[PDB]
Each structure stands twice: as C-alpha cells, then as structure tokens.
Short mmCIF file of C-alpha atoms in Angstrom, two decimals:
data_model
loop_
_atom_site.label_atom_id
_atom_site.label_comp_id
_atom_site.label_asym_id
_atom_site.label_seq_id
_atom_site.Cartn_x
_atom_site.Cartn_y
_atom_site.Cartn_z
CA UNK A 1 0.00 0.00 0.00
CA UNK A 2 3.09 2.24 0.17
CA UNK A 3 2.83 2.52 -3.60
CA UNK A 4 4.00 5.07 -6.19
CA UNK A 5 2.32 7.15 -8.90
CA UNK A 6 2.41 5.47 -12.29
CA UNK A 7 2.51 8.96 -13.83
CA UNK A 8 3.39 12.40 -12.42
CA UNK A 9 0.67 14.04 -10.33
CA UNK A 10 -0.18 17.69 -11.13
CA UNK A 11 -0.62 19.29 -7.70
CA UNK A 12 -1.59 22.63 -9.26
CA UNK A 13 -1.05 25.17 -6.51
CA UNK A 14 -3.29 28.23 -6.66
CA UNK A 15 -0.66 30.31 -8.47
CA UNK A 16 2.11 28.08 -9.89
CA UNK A 17 1.47 24.66 -11.38
CA UNK A 18 3.41 21.98 -9.51
CA UNK A 19 4.30 18.36 -10.20
CA UNK A 20 5.01 15.34 -8.01
CA UNK A 21 7.05 12.61 -9.68
CA UNK A 22 8.07 9.05 -8.90
CA UNK A 23 11.47 10.05 -7.51
CA UNK A 24 10.25 12.34 -4.72
CA UNK A 25 7.73 9.67 -3.70
CA UNK A 26 10.61 7.18 -3.75
CA UNK A 27 12.64 9.36 -1.37
CA UNK A 28 9.66 9.99 0.91
CA UNK A 29 8.90 6.27 1.14
CA UNK A 30 12.57 5.59 1.89
CA UNK A 31 12.46 8.06 4.78
CA UNK A 32 9.18 6.66 6.12
CA UNK A 33 10.45 3.08 5.99
CA UNK A 34 13.71 4.19 7.61
CA UNK A 35 11.72 5.57 10.54
CA UNK A 36 10.22 2.11 11.10
CA UNK A 37 7.09 3.37 12.85
CA UNK A 38 3.68 1.81 12.10
CA UNK A 39 1.91 2.78 8.88
CA UNK A 40 -0.39 5.45 10.31
CA UNK A 41 2.54 6.92 12.28
CA UNK A 42 5.07 6.91 9.43
CA UNK A 43 2.38 8.74 7.46
CA UNK A 44 3.58 11.82 9.34
CA UNK A 45 7.15 11.43 8.05
CA UNK A 46 5.97 10.71 4.51
CA UNK A 47 3.67 13.74 4.38
CA UNK A 48 6.28 15.96 6.05
CA UNK A 49 9.03 15.15 3.57
CA UNK B 1 18.34 17.44 -3.48
CA UNK B 2 17.25 14.30 -1.61
CA UNK B 3 18.88 14.96 1.77
CA UNK B 4 16.90 15.14 5.02
CA UNK B 5 18.28 16.28 8.37
CA UNK B 6 17.08 17.73 11.67
CA UNK B 7 17.52 21.23 10.24
CA UNK B 8 15.23 20.32 7.35
CA UNK B 9 12.66 18.89 9.77
CA UNK B 10 13.02 21.94 12.02
CA UNK B 11 12.61 24.27 9.04
CA UNK B 12 9.37 22.53 8.05
CA UNK B 13 8.15 22.60 11.65
CA UNK B 14 8.82 26.34 11.88
CA UNK B 15 7.04 27.08 8.59
CA UNK B 16 4.13 24.90 9.71
CA UNK B 17 3.84 26.76 13.02
CA UNK B 18 4.87 30.22 11.77
CA UNK B 19 1.74 30.47 9.58
CA UNK B 20 -1.51 28.64 10.27
CA UNK B 21 -3.59 31.01 8.13
CA UNK B 22 -2.63 33.46 5.39
CA UNK B 23 -1.59 36.96 6.47
CA UNK B 24 -2.47 40.24 4.78
CA UNK B 25 1.13 41.34 4.12
CA UNK B 26 2.59 37.94 3.18
CA UNK B 27 0.01 37.08 0.49
CA UNK B 28 1.96 38.90 -2.23
CA UNK B 29 1.80 35.91 -4.58
CA UNK B 30 -1.38 37.23 -6.21
CA UNK B 31 0.59 40.29 -7.31
CA UNK B 32 3.66 38.29 -8.34
CA UNK B 33 1.43 36.19 -10.60
CA UNK B 34 0.46 39.25 -12.64
CA UNK B 35 4.07 40.39 -13.14
CA UNK B 36 5.14 37.17 -14.86
CA UNK B 37 2.54 37.64 -17.60
CA UNK B 38 4.54 40.49 -19.23
CA UNK B 39 7.90 39.85 -20.89
CA UNK B 40 11.04 41.93 -20.47
CA UNK B 41 11.98 44.69 -22.90
CA UNK B 42 15.38 45.21 -24.52
CA UNK B 43 17.08 48.45 -25.57
CA UNK B 44 15.47 48.78 -29.01
CA UNK B 45 11.82 48.44 -27.97
CA UNK B 46 12.58 50.55 -24.90
CA UNK B 47 13.79 53.47 -27.02
CA UNK B 48 10.94 53.07 -29.52
CA UNK B 49 8.41 53.06 -26.68
#
C-alpha cells in the first residue's frame, strides 16, 4: 500500500502549477520506511518530507 | 536534493507553526502572478516606446 504514482501528479497550486514525480515519492517512502514506525505513524514522516 | 536532516525537519516545523492562516502582508503571490505575464523589454523596444 506504500505505492508510487504510475505517472506524475499535477498538484496545481493556486498560483504556480506543480508536479510530483516518482522520484520524490521514492525518497519519501525511503524516509518513512527508515523511521520504522507503524503505517499510520510513518504517514507523518511521509507527508512531512 | 534528496537529503533530510534535523535542520530540514526543524525548518518545516517552523514554517508549519509560523503560519496557520494566510496573512495580509505575506500574500503577495497574487501580485507576483500578474508580473510574470509580461515579458522583459530590450534596448530597441525601450527606445521606440
């Protein structure tokens, strides 16, 4: 369930268009899994990064 | 790039706490949006104008 986007996600801030890609999700998942906390607790690290 | 440290976490924590709702003086992005819509002039068009 700690999956990745098959294609980039347009986040589309109110002023500047923004894009999430597979690599930033990769890094965020790496940090969350490094923390080792349960899923709903490592959610904090994932969202923060 | 993809490097995370306590300073990065602290910086995010500060930004998260330093602004819970938008302020009147810090919401300049609406103005900055309208500047980007006009391109820069060079010498020739400047003198003609």
